[PDB]
Write a protein that binds this ligand. Structure first.
Ligand SMILES: [Zn+2]
Ligand SMILES: [Zn+2]
Ligand SMILES: [Zn+2]
Ligand SMILES: [Zn+2]
Lengths: 76, 77
DNA sequence: TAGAACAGGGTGTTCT
DNA sequence: AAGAACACCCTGTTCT
């Protein structure tokens, strides 16, 4: 009951390999299967917090990936 | 000139005083008539264009004001 | 944990 | 022009 590793909201467990909130869990699944090519409108370093995480899915997705989120994580 | 001065998409006319596209017309009306408590996740200079204008309402609204958008542009002869 | 599904919000086009 | 309104999409929650 701590804090999302992606946005620093309240984490609701470990999803796809990483301690993340529920909003980040579902955002990640959607980004991976939708195959979206997001583009940042700043510098590829946007603030991803509870308030701003929706602004830049490019940087949010990148953070997910860099925290090591992965769909075949449980299979491991 | 026929490009939107807020996002560079194709402008459809002069709205609220400024050459803009229909999306920036209604975005601006919505932002002025309501709350626009928006937060930039970058450094307040996000690139606002057709493909990214959705990412940052803080910056898209600053750009509208900066271009001179105002609701009473019409009644302002 | 993982996913469907719903419900709310923002967007951008049509307005036979 | 200006504005209503509709469909679409994205997000985040509740439920399984
Ligand atoms: Zn999160
Ligand atoms: Zn970004
Ligand atoms: Zn525009
Ligand atoms: Zn911004």
């Amino acid at each position: 009951s701590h804090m999302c590793l992606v946005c620093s909201d309240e984490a609701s467990g470990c999803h796809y390999g990483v301690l993340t909130c529920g909003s980040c869990k579902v955002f990640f699944k959607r980004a991976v299967e939708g195959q979206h090519n997001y583009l940042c409108a700043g510098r590829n370093d946007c603030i991803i917090d509870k308030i701003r995480r929706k602004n830049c899915p490019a940087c949010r997705y990148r953070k997910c990936l860099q925290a090591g989120m992965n769909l075949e994580a449980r299979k491991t």
